[PDB]
């Protein structure tokens, strides 16, 4: 499905984020039978969108709810819309959403972190008010991405269990909008930017227009047109270019025009001219070895859950700018597109990841599970199909973002059973055909080591999650150092791939200080991080370090029973722990994007 | 002036809350001279609106900045807006704002918590993009509401000093919006709803139209038309009505139409049919004695400052619904209008207050160069009074139709001991009564200006007493405080025979601090401190309200934080409950709704 992000000019957007919506629980699952979308929601209350519904109400019974919830709101179509193509779009409805315009079912979606839209022109009269009803479901099963399993007790009460660390927040987490286009419109764009030794060259264009003739022009930051092209595709611009570089992120504007006999459509696409490639043990941006610094993150904050917020990304970005982070990873689900836009504009490198986390029954944090992970009753052929679909929707959404340099199709799957490689090999090869321009990865769980892991050879970059090393090493630092280094070297011998440690750190209660440098203390977090740093600087194959996590986040419970939820460098209200200043000195102390010399 | 809150009707709005604006500091104050609005802001950064600019960037040098900041943003004007009147509106720009469309200066405003808008039709071309630049100033002087004084040191670096407890957050704190109307449009509406022993009547209106004929229709919640009328202002409608009551807040819809016969304009106004009146020592809503419970609040949250936010509004209301608060006060400044909208719909009682706080030089928290005469040319003067009156004007005209607002508070804790005091406030008190006779009026009293020394309280209808800091003067002793408090309350009862609301009480409490000794800063002491007030309240007939200070921990100025008083909340800043939250809940849900406990408690 083609998706382009809405921008304004021959097109227009009316944001429906005006938060307050009618909101209801459907504890008896009678909402569909009684067609709640036909009238006003009964016994509803005010809720804010975007935002998770879970923490908005200080109510535990709502927070831990599993099943269907209902959103509802009336909105006016502008008068001036008539004659235009009118689209209703949800940037994200977490897990499942079904939408009604008045009484007409218009769209449906499974997948909680990517947009979905439908042409609603025949069901609205511009200038009138229309009722919009959304049925949102938060249940996970073996075919959802991520997977989980629902447990219904004797009384028929549902309770959600799952296998990832973060809390299962749900609701309309991101922007809802109506947007307009001419009946002739640009429906899809794909751009590839080749570079050759940085004095030269090119921007390849493939464009799909639902119904028009295509012209294309490229302007710089000064708006000087620097190249032009004709045709639905084949376009191969010619440039002596300002390259999209980490830390700067120069952007061109690719204006795409689509001409009918009577109508024209103009679409501006931000373009960053840069190359990404793996060469041996190195990751190359613009044919230069890059060293990642930064975080695994989460979409998590007080009150709003995974709900999107402008003040929050402004603040968070000022923080990882200050600390010297040049990169991050969209940990365990696709993020709101605004972060990617931010990264594009500010030259921030991003590892884009699917919501495929929890394909693992051996994590061991917890208290009726299938014994075969890859089997009909668990991860099956439909799961693989859902997994592939999740990869499609992520790539189709983010293929043009210069900030995205790699695709992560999963996080910490158990790769020890035999059916593992049969599951992932097709996904890995489908991913390469959906987007050949970017290296591919699958984030490795630690107990699936170099000796036991079966799938990593299918990918381009080795991303290692090392977080719970403090558990297995019982907190001993010098056993941890020698164990860490020999495992990293073993991975370097098995694969000869560039290595990024995408998770490392330890749970740290802010304000706990110790003279013994022991667990949960701020001092231990510093010493624990510092040992990873010393080892990284002695291993040539390591090209990246991303700390887990940026800030304390709410966890499943689940993880909170080990407690469990203090993994951040910052607190949830974004206050720095002492380790924040340790990272700042290391990350601002090195030459930008340059691995430190052997060793340090 | 003419302010009506935008609704979609014949009128359309494009929110400019698409938060990311261009943002820059102006430390050399060259922005106006180099005419920054003509081009794109140089060396700017992304900022979010609505929101304070202070805490968005983790930067102290930006947080403590005093002077001009610049906002800038490009936006497309809708295609179907051609032929329409196009207005550019800011719900609030905190303290001062000046706005440019492209190169055309279109508006200017002083006052940080009330809307201002301008017809920009001749300066925009529909279907094209226009550059919008806002110069925002956060400086306070003796003529601003609230007042303060700016100090320029050795090096010429500005530094802001002021007299209120909360931090001087600034920026575009609330919604920005372009909206449209037909060239014939409803420009103002005023509604007064009379009630008489609650079985019947009445609704008087007044509508100002720039240029059209007026029809008026009133529909109930079922959308049944229940009354109609004609004329620009003649309506005095007749109903056997469902009255707006605390805890429910039934609302009617008054549809106002303005007709040319090439153009028509329709405006829906929510109307709550209720009466508010003082009679002796009682506060009457719909001729029924009402008892206030709840909080003094603040517009304060992590990261965003005083920036407005829907999730936070939903959560806080879930909390003070749960806790049994039936009311609150817009402490020390006008709040965003959405809150009043919430209160109207949910039947929540509100004391609406101006930003006139800090008219006092004797509070004594902080370290130094202050005028000796509070009411004089060098301090609070005649121009200050004019700004003060202007602030009252803008508040009332914005909130005159909100049924949740049951009284106006024109000031908070002014020093009334100096010589110019009664001369300053008496005109303001009477000007306000002329602006809206329908609502009782008040001025929140500082404790040191007691019954013997206060000179202005007789000029008002309801006595609002701030008793926070009782713990300070009483050295934390509970039963001396209990004895002092009861007598001061009785002293006020004999001097004035006004109904008494305690609008501030509580004590600074470090969340998570527990003590076997029930000492200061501990949660156990806070519960014990609050309870002593409750016992005294239940012994005084004149007390008709208790509002705790404060709802949640909020950021304070350095002076207050040097004594470290930013822990005044019942809840923390991230909205976690202290043990007192559960004490108030049991008391407030335990009493009959809106009913003062019987004598004894
Ligand atoms: C903090 C903690 C607590 C408990 C109760 C655990 N039990 C386990 O089986 C395991 C298994 N294990 C050790 C490998 O030999 C790991 S590293 N489990 C793991 C858990 C969550 C992840 O995201 C990754 C790995 C770890 C563990 C950790
Ligand atoms: C917690 C605290 C701390 C300090 C350093 C003080 N100095 C005072 O002179 C005063 C003056 N005072 C006692 C005479 O009744 C009061 S009540 N001052 C006051 C301060 C702020 C207000 O919002 C209200 C009153 C109080 C005070 C309180």
Short mmCIF file of N, CA and C in Angstrom, two decimals, chain B residues 301-438:
data_model
loop_
_atom_site.label_atom_id
_atom_site.label_comp_id
_atom_site.label_asym_id
_atom_site.label_seq_id
_atom_site.Cartn_x
_atom_site.Cartn_y
_atom_site.Cartn_z
N UNK B 301 3.74 21.85 34.91
CA UNK B 301 4.05 20.48 34.67
C UNK B 301 5.47 20.36 34.19
N UNK B 302 5.99 19.16 34.27
CA UNK B 302 7.32 18.88 33.89
C UNK B 302 7.49 19.18 32.44
N UNK B 303 8.61 19.76 32.09
CA UNK B 303 9.01 19.97 30.72
C UNK B 303 8.29 21.08 29.96
N UNK B 304 6.99 21.14 30.08
CA UNK B 304 6.20 22.07 29.33
C UNK B 304 5.95 23.42 30.01
N UNK B 305 6.31 23.55 31.27
CA UNK B 305 5.98 24.71 32.05
C UNK B 305 4.51 24.92 32.31
N UNK B 306 4.01 26.06 31.87
CA UNK B 306 2.61 26.44 32.00
C UNK B 306 1.94 26.10 30.71
N UNK B 307 2.66 25.40 29.87
CA UNK B 307 2.13 24.98 28.58
C UNK B 307 0.90 24.13 28.78
N UNK B 308 -0.07 24.34 27.91
CA UNK B 308 -1.34 23.64 27.98
C UNK B 308 -1.25 22.20 27.47
N UNK B 309 -2.04 21.28 28.05
CA UNK B 309 -1.98 19.87 27.63
C UNK B 309 -3.21 19.01 27.99
N UNK B 310 -3.79 18.36 26.99
CA UNK B 310 -5.01 17.58 27.18
C UNK B 310 -4.90 16.35 28.11
N UNK B 311 -3.83 15.57 27.98
CA UNK B 311 -3.64 14.40 28.85
C UNK B 311 -3.61 14.83 30.31
N UNK B 312 -2.86 15.87 30.60
CA UNK B 312 -2.75 16.40 31.94
C UNK B 312 -4.05 16.93 32.47
N UNK B 313 -4.84 17.56 31.63
CA UNK B 313 -6.16 17.97 32.03
C UNK B 313 -7.03 16.81 32.32
N UNK B 314 -6.97 15.74 31.55
CA UNK B 314 -7.76 14.57 31.86
C UNK B 314 -7.37 13.87 33.15
N UNK B 315 -6.08 13.67 33.37
CA UNK B 315 -5.61 13.03 34.58
C UNK B 315 -5.89 13.79 35.84
N UNK B 316 -5.63 15.07 35.85
CA UNK B 316 -5.85 15.89 37.05
C UNK B 316 -7.32 15.88 37.46
N UNK B 317 -8.21 15.86 36.47
CA UNK B 317 -9.63 15.88 36.76
C UNK B 317 -10.10 14.53 37.27
N UNK B 318 -9.46 13.47 36.78
CA UNK B 318 -9.77 12.14 37.28
C UNK B 318 -9.39 12.10 38.75
N UNK B 319 -8.31 12.80 39.08
CA UNK B 319 -7.84 12.84 40.45
C UNK B 319 -8.72 13.65 41.40
N UNK B 320 -9.16 14.84 40.99
CA UNK B 320 -9.92 15.64 41.95
C UNK B 320 -11.41 15.31 41.88
N UNK B 321 -11.79 14.45 40.94
CA UNK B 321 -13.09 13.80 40.99
C UNK B 321 -13.04 12.67 42.01
N UNK B 322 -11.99 11.87 41.94
CA UNK B 322 -11.77 10.77 42.86
C UNK B 322 -11.63 11.26 44.30
N UNK B 323 -10.96 12.40 44.48
CA UNK B 323 -10.65 12.88 45.81
C UNK B 323 -11.83 13.61 46.44
N UNK B 324 -12.82 13.97 45.63
CA UNK B 324 -14.03 14.57 46.15
C UNK B 324 -14.03 16.08 46.15
N UNK B 325 -13.09 16.68 45.42
CA UNK B 325 -13.06 18.12 45.25
C UNK B 325 -14.24 18.55 44.39
N UNK B 326 -15.02 19.52 44.87
CA UNK B 326 -16.14 20.04 44.10
C UNK B 326 -15.82 21.38 43.45
N UNK B 327 -14.64 21.91 43.74
CA UNK B 327 -14.29 23.24 43.27
C UNK B 327 -12.80 23.49 43.25
N UNK B 328 -12.40 24.58 42.61
CA UNK B 328 -11.03 25.06 42.69
C UNK B 328 -10.94 26.53 42.29
N UNK B 329 -9.74 27.09 42.40
CA UNK B 329 -9.50 28.48 42.08
C UNK B 329 -8.33 28.63 41.10
N UNK B 330 -8.53 29.43 40.05
CA UNK B 330 -7.50 29.61 39.03
C UNK B 330 -6.36 30.46 39.57
N UNK B 331 -5.57 29.85 40.46
CA UNK B 331 -4.64 30.58 41.31
C UNK B 331 -3.63 31.46 40.57
N UNK B 332 -3.85 32.77 40.72
CA UNK B 332 -2.88 33.83 40.45
C UNK B 332 -2.71 34.15 38.97
N UNK B 333 -3.60 33.59 38.14
CA UNK B 333 -3.70 33.93 36.72
C UNK B 333 -4.88 33.22 36.07
N UNK B 334 -5.43 33.82 35.00
CA UNK B 334 -6.47 33.16 34.21
C UNK B 334 -5.97 31.87 33.57
N UNK B 335 -6.77 30.82 33.67
CA UNK B 335 -6.40 29.53 33.11
C UNK B 335 -6.85 29.41 31.65
N UNK B 336 -6.35 28.39 30.97
CA UNK B 336 -6.79 28.09 29.60
C UNK B 336 -8.29 27.79 29.61
N UNK B 337 -9.00 28.23 28.57
CA UNK B 337 -10.46 28.20 28.56
C UNK B 337 -11.08 26.80 28.52
N UNK B 338 -10.28 25.84 28.08
CA UNK B 338 -10.70 24.47 28.01
C UNK B 338 -11.01 23.92 29.37
N UNK B 339 -10.30 24.37 30.38
CA UNK B 339 -10.62 23.97 31.73
C UNK B 339 -11.97 24.44 32.15
N UNK B 340 -12.34 25.67 31.81
CA UNK B 340 -13.65 26.18 32.18
C UNK B 340 -14.73 25.40 31.45
N UNK B 341 -14.44 25.10 30.20
CA UNK B 341 -15.28 24.26 29.36
C UNK B 341 -15.50 22.92 30.05
N UNK B 342 -14.42 22.35 30.60
CA UNK B 342 -14.52 21.10 31.33
C UNK B 342 -15.42 21.26 32.55
N UNK B 343 -15.16 22.32 33.31
CA UNK B 343 -15.93 22.60 34.52
C UNK B 343 -17.41 22.82 34.21
N UNK B 344 -17.71 23.54 33.12
CA UNK B 344 -19.09 23.78 32.70
C UNK B 344 -19.82 22.46 32.46
N UNK B 345 -19.14 21.55 31.79
CA UNK B 345 -19.73 20.28 31.37
C UNK B 345 -19.87 19.28 32.52
N UNK B 346 -18.96 19.34 33.48
CA UNK B 346 -18.93 18.38 34.58
C UNK B 346 -19.48 18.90 35.91
N UNK B 347 -19.94 20.15 35.93
CA UNK B 347 -20.54 20.72 37.12
C UNK B 347 -19.54 21.03 38.21
N UNK B 348 -18.41 21.59 37.81
CA UNK B 348 -17.35 21.93 38.75
C UNK B 348 -17.35 23.44 39.03
N UNK B 349 -17.36 23.80 40.31
CA UNK B 349 -17.39 25.20 40.72
C UNK B 349 -16.01 25.86 40.67
N UNK B 350 -15.93 27.06 40.11
CA UNK B 350 -14.64 27.71 39.91
C UNK B 350 -14.60 29.14 40.43
N UNK B 351 -13.54 29.47 41.16
CA UNK B 351 -13.24 30.84 41.51
C UNK B 351 -12.25 31.39 40.49
N UNK B 352 -12.72 32.26 39.61
CA UNK B 352 -11.89 32.78 38.53
C UNK B 352 -11.07 33.97 39.01
N UNK B 353 -9.77 33.94 38.78
CA UNK B 353 -8.88 34.94 39.34
C UNK B 353 -7.97 35.61 38.31
N UNK B 354 -7.74 36.91 38.49
CA UNK B 354 -6.81 37.66 37.66
C UNK B 354 -5.36 37.31 38.01
N UNK B 355 -4.43 37.88 37.25
CA UNK B 355 -3.01 37.64 37.49
C UNK B 355 -2.42 38.66 38.45
N UNK B 356 -3.28 39.38 39.16
CA UNK B 356 -2.85 40.43 40.07
C UNK B 356 -2.34 39.87 41.39
N UNK B 357 -1.15 39.30 41.35
CA UNK B 357 -0.49 38.76 42.52
C UNK B 357 0.88 39.43 42.63
N UNK B 358 1.37 39.62 43.85
CA UNK B 358 2.68 40.22 44.05
C UNK B 358 2.60 41.67 44.47
N UNK B 359 1.39 42.15 44.74
CA UNK B 359 1.20 43.51 45.24
C UNK B 359 1.49 43.55 46.73
N UNK B 360 2.68 43.11 47.08
CA UNK B 360 3.07 42.98 48.44
C UNK B 360 4.58 43.00 48.52
N UNK B 361 5.16 43.69 49.48
CA UNK B 361 6.59 43.72 49.62
C UNK B 361 7.03 43.22 50.96
N UNK B 362 6.10 42.66 51.70
CA UNK B 362 6.36 42.16 53.02
C UNK B 362 6.25 40.65 53.21
N UNK B 363 6.20 39.89 52.14
CA UNK B 363 6.06 38.45 52.26
C UNK B 363 7.25 37.86 52.96
N UNK B 364 8.44 38.36 52.65
CA UNK B 364 9.61 37.99 53.39
C UNK B 364 10.31 36.68 53.08
N UNK B 365 9.96 36.04 51.99
CA UNK B 365 10.69 34.87 51.57
C UNK B 365 11.65 35.28 50.47
N UNK B 366 12.93 35.22 50.80
CA UNK B 366 13.97 35.65 49.88
C UNK B 366 14.95 36.59 50.55
N UNK B 367 16.09 36.82 49.91
CA UNK B 367 17.11 37.71 50.45
C UNK B 367 16.83 39.16 50.07
N UNK B 368 17.50 42.73 50.50
CA UNK B 368 18.51 43.21 49.57
C UNK B 368 18.20 44.60 49.05
N UNK B 369 16.44 46.97 48.11
CA UNK B 369 16.39 47.90 47.00
C UNK B 369 14.98 48.05 46.51
N UNK B 370 14.04 48.01 47.44
CA UNK B 370 12.63 48.07 47.11
C UNK B 370 11.97 49.36 47.57
N UNK B 371 10.96 49.84 46.72
CA UNK B 371 10.33 51.08 47.19
C UNK B 371 9.79 51.00 48.58
N UNK B 372 9.65 52.13 49.26
CA UNK B 372 9.16 52.11 50.64
C UNK B 372 7.66 52.31 50.69
N UNK B 373 7.11 52.97 49.67
CA UNK B 373 5.67 53.17 49.58
C UNK B 373 5.11 52.30 48.48
N UNK B 374 4.36 51.26 48.86
CA UNK B 374 3.81 50.31 47.90
C UNK B 374 2.91 51.02 46.89
N UNK B 375 2.00 51.86 47.38
CA UNK B 375 1.12 52.60 46.49
C UNK B 375 1.62 54.02 46.25
N UNK B 376 2.46 54.17 45.23
CA UNK B 376 3.06 55.45 44.88
C UNK B 376 3.62 55.37 43.47
N UNK B 377 4.04 56.52 42.94
CA UNK B 377 4.51 56.62 41.56
C UNK B 377 5.69 55.69 41.27
N UNK B 378 6.53 55.46 42.27
CA UNK B 378 7.72 54.63 42.09
C UNK B 378 7.39 53.14 42.14
N UNK B 379 6.15 52.83 42.51
CA UNK B 379 5.70 51.44 42.56
C UNK B 379 4.33 51.29 41.93
N UNK B 380 3.36 50.86 42.73
CA UNK B 380 1.99 50.72 42.28
C UNK B 380 1.35 52.09 42.13
N UNK B 381 1.21 52.55 40.89
CA UNK B 381 0.69 53.88 40.64
C UNK B 381 -0.62 53.85 39.86
N UNK B 382 -0.98 55.01 39.30
CA UNK B 382 -2.23 55.16 38.58
C UNK B 382 -2.26 54.40 37.27
N UNK B 383 -1.11 54.30 36.62
CA UNK B 383 -0.99 53.54 35.38
C UNK B 383 -1.10 52.05 35.66
N UNK B 384 -0.61 51.65 36.83
CA UNK B 384 -0.71 50.27 37.29
C UNK B 384 -2.16 49.88 37.50
N UNK B 385 -2.90 50.76 38.16
CA UNK B 385 -4.33 50.58 38.37
C UNK B 385 -5.07 50.44 37.04
N UNK B 386 -4.62 51.19 36.04
CA UNK B 386 -5.25 51.17 34.72
C UNK B 386 -5.00 49.82 34.05
N UNK B 387 -3.79 49.30 34.19
CA UNK B 387 -3.44 47.98 33.67
C UNK B 387 -4.21 46.91 34.43
N UNK B 388 -4.36 47.13 35.73
CA UNK B 388 -5.08 46.20 36.59
C UNK B 388 -6.54 46.13 36.16
N UNK B 389 -7.14 47.29 35.92
CA UNK B 389 -8.52 47.36 35.47
C UNK B 389 -8.66 46.68 34.11
N UNK B 390 -7.69 46.93 33.23
CA UNK B 390 -7.68 46.34 31.90
C UNK B 390 -7.64 44.82 31.99
N UNK B 391 -6.86 44.30 32.94
CA UNK B 391 -6.75 42.86 33.15
C UNK B 391 -8.07 42.26 33.61
N UNK B 392 -8.78 42.98 34.48
CA UNK B 392 -10.10 42.55 34.93
C UNK B 392 -11.09 42.56 33.77
N UNK B 393 -10.95 43.56 32.90
CA UNK B 393 -11.83 43.69 31.74
C UNK B 393 -11.69 42.49 30.82
N UNK B 394 -10.44 42.17 30.47
CA UNK B 394 -10.16 41.09 29.54
C UNK B 394 -10.56 39.74 30.12
N UNK B 395 -10.44 39.58 31.43
CA UNK B 395 -10.83 38.33 32.07
C UNK B 395 -12.34 38.10 32.01
N UNK B 396 -13.10 39.10 32.46
CA UNK B 396 -14.55 38.99 32.55
C UNK B 396 -15.19 38.82 31.18
N UNK B 397 -14.74 39.61 30.21
CA UNK B 397 -15.28 39.52 28.85
C UNK B 397 -15.02 38.15 28.23
N UNK B 398 -14.00 37.46 28.74
CA UNK B 398 -13.67 36.15 28.21
C UNK B 398 -14.51 35.08 28.90
N UNK B 399 -14.79 35.29 30.18
CA UNK B 399 -15.38 34.24 31.02
C UNK B 399 -16.77 34.54 31.57
N UNK B 400 -17.41 35.60 31.07
CA UNK B 400 -18.70 36.05 31.61
C UNK B 400 -19.83 35.03 31.41
N UNK B 401 -19.68 34.15 30.43
CA UNK B 401 -20.72 33.19 30.09
C UNK B 401 -20.48 31.78 30.61
N UNK B 402 -19.37 31.57 31.32
CA UNK B 402 -19.07 30.26 31.89
C UNK B 402 -19.85 30.06 33.19
N UNK B 403 -20.81 29.12 33.21
CA UNK B 403 -21.58 28.89 34.43
C UNK B 403 -20.75 28.36 35.60
N UNK B 404 -19.61 27.73 35.30
CA UNK B 404 -18.76 27.17 36.34
C UNK B 404 -18.12 28.25 37.20
N UNK B 405 -17.84 29.39 36.58
CA UNK B 405 -17.28 30.53 37.29
C UNK B 405 -18.37 31.14 38.15
N UNK B 406 -18.21 31.04 39.46
CA UNK B 406 -19.24 31.54 40.36
C UNK B 406 -18.83 32.82 41.07
N UNK B 407 -17.55 33.18 41.00
CA UNK B 407 -17.13 34.50 41.46
C UNK B 407 -15.80 34.93 40.87
N UNK B 408 -15.54 36.23 40.91
CA UNK B 408 -14.29 36.80 40.42
C UNK B 408 -13.35 37.14 41.57
N UNK B 409 -12.09 36.72 41.46
CA UNK B 409 -11.06 37.15 42.39
C UNK B 409 -10.13 38.13 41.68
N UNK B 410 -10.12 39.38 42.13
CA UNK B 410 -9.43 40.43 41.39
C UNK B 410 -7.98 40.60 41.82
N UNK B 411 -7.61 39.97 42.93
CA UNK B 411 -6.23 40.03 43.42
C UNK B 411 -5.95 38.92 44.42
N UNK B 412 -4.67 38.62 44.61
CA UNK B 412 -4.26 37.63 45.60
C UNK B 412 -3.16 38.15 46.52
N UNK B 413 -3.49 38.24 47.80
CA UNK B 413 -2.56 38.67 48.85
C UNK B 413 -1.89 40.03 48.64
N UNK B 414 -2.69 41.08 48.43
CA UNK B 414 -2.02 42.38 48.40
C UNK B 414 -1.75 42.88 49.81
N UNK B 415 -0.68 43.64 49.98
CA UNK B 415 -0.44 44.30 51.26
C UNK B 415 -1.39 45.49 51.38
N UNK B 416 -2.28 45.43 52.37
CA UNK B 416 -3.31 46.46 52.51
C UNK B 416 -3.02 47.38 53.70
N UNK B 417 -1.84 47.22 54.29
CA UNK B 417 -1.40 48.06 55.40
C UNK B 417 -0.84 49.43 54.96
N UNK B 418 -0.07 49.48 53.85
CA UNK B 418 0.38 50.80 53.39
C UNK B 418 -0.76 51.79 53.09
N UNK B 419 -0.37 53.04 52.85
CA UNK B 419 -1.31 54.15 52.89
C UNK B 419 -2.24 54.25 51.68
N UNK B 420 -1.74 53.93 50.49
CA UNK B 420 -2.54 54.06 49.28
C UNK B 420 -3.53 52.95 48.98
N UNK B 421 -3.63 51.97 49.87
CA UNK B 421 -4.35 50.73 49.57
C UNK B 421 -5.83 50.86 49.25
N UNK B 422 -6.62 51.42 50.16
CA UNK B 422 -8.06 51.48 49.96
C UNK B 422 -8.42 52.37 48.77
N UNK B 423 -7.58 53.37 48.51
CA UNK B 423 -7.78 54.26 47.37
C UNK B 423 -7.53 53.53 46.06
N UNK B 424 -6.67 52.52 46.11
CA UNK B 424 -6.35 51.75 44.91
C UNK B 424 -7.43 50.75 44.55
N UNK B 425 -7.96 50.04 45.54
CA UNK B 425 -8.80 48.88 45.27
C UNK B 425 -10.30 49.20 45.15
N UNK B 426 -10.77 50.19 45.90
CA UNK B 426 -12.19 50.55 45.89
C UNK B 426 -12.76 50.83 44.49
N UNK B 427 -12.04 51.61 43.65
CA UNK B 427 -12.57 51.76 42.29
C UNK B 427 -12.59 50.44 41.52
N UNK B 428 -11.53 49.64 41.67
CA UNK B 428 -11.44 48.36 40.98
C UNK B 428 -12.59 47.44 41.38
N UNK B 429 -12.90 47.41 42.67
CA UNK B 429 -13.99 46.58 43.17
C UNK B 429 -15.33 46.98 42.58
N UNK B 430 -15.52 48.28 42.36
CA UNK B 430 -16.80 48.79 41.85
C UNK B 430 -16.87 48.77 40.33
N UNK B 431 -15.71 48.89 39.68
CA UNK B 431 -15.65 48.77 38.23
C UNK B 431 -15.97 47.34 37.84
N UNK B 432 -15.47 46.40 38.64
CA UNK B 432 -15.67 44.99 38.36
C UNK B 432 -17.16 44.64 38.52
N UNK B 433 -17.80 45.19 39.56
CA UNK B 433 -19.22 44.95 39.79
C UNK B 433 -20.07 45.49 38.65
N UNK B 434 -19.54 46.48 37.94
CA UNK B 434 -20.26 47.07 36.81
C UNK B 434 -20.05 46.23 35.55
N UNK B 435 -18.92 45.54 35.49
CA UNK B 435 -18.61 44.67 34.36
C UNK B 435 -19.43 43.38 34.38
N UNK B 436 -19.75 42.90 35.57
CA UNK B 436 -20.62 41.74 35.72
C UNK B 436 -21.26 41.71 37.10
N UNK B 437 -22.52 42.18 37.20
CA UNK B 437 -23.27 42.22 38.46
C UNK B 437 -23.77 40.84 38.88
N UNK B 438 -23.73 39.89 37.95
CA UNK B 438 -24.31 38.57 38.16
C UNK B 438 -23.50 37.72 39.13
#
